[PDB]
């Protein structure tokens, strides 16, 4: 074994079918060895078109299988290499094999199409234009998904998820509406990996305009996304939290469906998750919720989440702290006077003042905005003096005075307004 590319070329070109099979096996072994498949050597030998033609040889199903595997591995490389597979006519040929009576050939064609679509929007739309969605969904048309082999079902879920992926442009609306019902079924399956890729698909489809968010929401997936948010497997929580985060960027009505499904009961553990990426994502999601209606801010209060946002603002890494500050600003600009009082009783002032030491200019503006909003609520109550002594007792007044020297302009004018308005006489 360890054939040379020249040996492979020789065997593939013969009129002997048995030597074509052996040569394709050698090519597949050469292309499936862990490190450095010599993909470019294979492309330059001109083998792609011949492999694509073998994909049609329904008689010799072994050479169909070996070709599909070789081409899967070529299509799994760079965009330039995936492009050679596409220019070789491979997409229609793989689509044809989706109907093969041999399950393992059909699976390998699903996998190859996943790699092609995974290259980007352009190749994803090619795959859809050649009509891949119908035969793919027909493979999942069985009433009980547990009858499919676990590996088969996983690859179908992964390839479907790649047809939902990427933007500029987003997938065509026709295709999304065709895929969503099957995606809903997969989201209720039990296999961890199926659930993870289904969540990734939903997170792709909800990454876009509110119109796309409504397509997914109207299918009823939010309660199951929330249940998967409470899972213990991090590869499920990550995409589920990504999807929930996208949905609460939409309207107050779409955000409310996330709250109605109970999402706020899971967020205390997300905001204290040991993985920094989860905390940051969950805090960002909280800032868009606190940007909603006053009654939705109130459900944040009632689920006891304010003390956890204060915790994040106090103890988290700086990038997550930025997100928490945004959630406070949004809270203080949209909240009632009684909600702001409660925010103050939770100890917001000090951790907020402490972040005014941050070099980052954007966050300083966010913080000053929150301070002004709280002062406006304090004016309604006639308690601006009480709030002003509180800011002095946290070390805050010195930091606000120091801001005058700041280079930025909006910071300069903002801090001077606060000092003249509440720290005079």
């Amino acid at each position: 074994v360890n054939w040379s590319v020249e040996d492979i070329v020789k065997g593939i070109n013969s009129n002997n079918l048995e030597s074509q099979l052996q040569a394709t096996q050698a090519a597949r072994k050469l292309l499936s060895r862990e490190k450095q498949p010599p993909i470019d050597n294979i492309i330059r030998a001109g083998l792609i078109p011949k492999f694509v033609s073998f994909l049609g040889k329904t008689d010799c199903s072994p050479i169909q299988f070996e070709s599909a595997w070789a081409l899967t591995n070529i299509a799994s490389g760079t965009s330039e290499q995936t492009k050679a597979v596409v220019d070789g006519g491979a997409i229609p040929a793989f689509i044809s094999l989706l109907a093969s009576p041999h399950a393992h050939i059909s699976e390998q064609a699903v996998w190859a199409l996943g790699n092609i679509a995974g290259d980007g929007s352009a190749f994803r739309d090619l795959v859809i234009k050649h009509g891949a969605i119908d035969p793919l969904l027909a493979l999942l048309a069985v009433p009980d998904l547990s009858t499919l082999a676990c590996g088969y079902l996983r690859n179908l879920t992964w390839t479907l998820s790649n047809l939902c992926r990427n933007k500029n442009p987003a997938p065509p609306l026709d295709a999304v509406e065709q895929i969503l019902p099957t995606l809903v079924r997969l989201l209720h399956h039990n296999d961890p990996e199926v659930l993870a890729d289904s969540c990734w698909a939903i997170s792709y489809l909800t990454d876009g305009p509110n119109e796309r968010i409504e397509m997914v929401v109207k299918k009823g997936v939010v309660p199951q996304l929330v249940k998967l948010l409470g899972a213990t497997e991090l590869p499920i929580v990550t995409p589920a939290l990504r999807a929930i985060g996208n949905i609460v960027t939409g309207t107050d009505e779409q955000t409310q469906k996330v709250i109605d499904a109970g999402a706020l009961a899971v967020f205390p553990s997300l905001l204290t998750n040991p993985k920094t990426n989860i905390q940051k994502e969950a805090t960002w999601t909280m800032s868009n919720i606190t940007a909603g209606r006053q009654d939705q801010i109130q459900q944040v209060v009632n689920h006891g989440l304010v003390p956890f946002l204060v915790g994040v603002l106090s103890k988290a890494d700086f990038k997550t702290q930025k997100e928490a500050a945004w959630a406070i600003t949004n809270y203080t600009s949209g909240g009632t006077v009684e909600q702001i009082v409660y925010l103050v009783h939770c100890g917001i002032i000090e951790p907020l003042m402490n972040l005014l030491s941050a070099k980052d200019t954007k966050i300083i503006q966010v913080i000053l905005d929150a301070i002004s909003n709280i002062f406006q609520a304090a004016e309604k109550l006639g308690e601006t003096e009480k709030l002003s002594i509180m800011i002095e007792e946290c070390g805050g007044l010195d930091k606000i005075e120091a801001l005058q020297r700041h280079e930025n302009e909006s910071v300069y004018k903002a801090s001077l307004n606060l000092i003249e308005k509440y720290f005079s006489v």
Binding site: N246, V248, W284, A291, G292, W326, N330, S333
Partner: peptide, 11 residues
């Protein structure tokens, strides 16, 4: 609006 969709661009 008050909601931010572009956390990624915000970076």
């Amino acid at each position: 609006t008050n909601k931010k969709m572009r956390r990624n661009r915000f970076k």
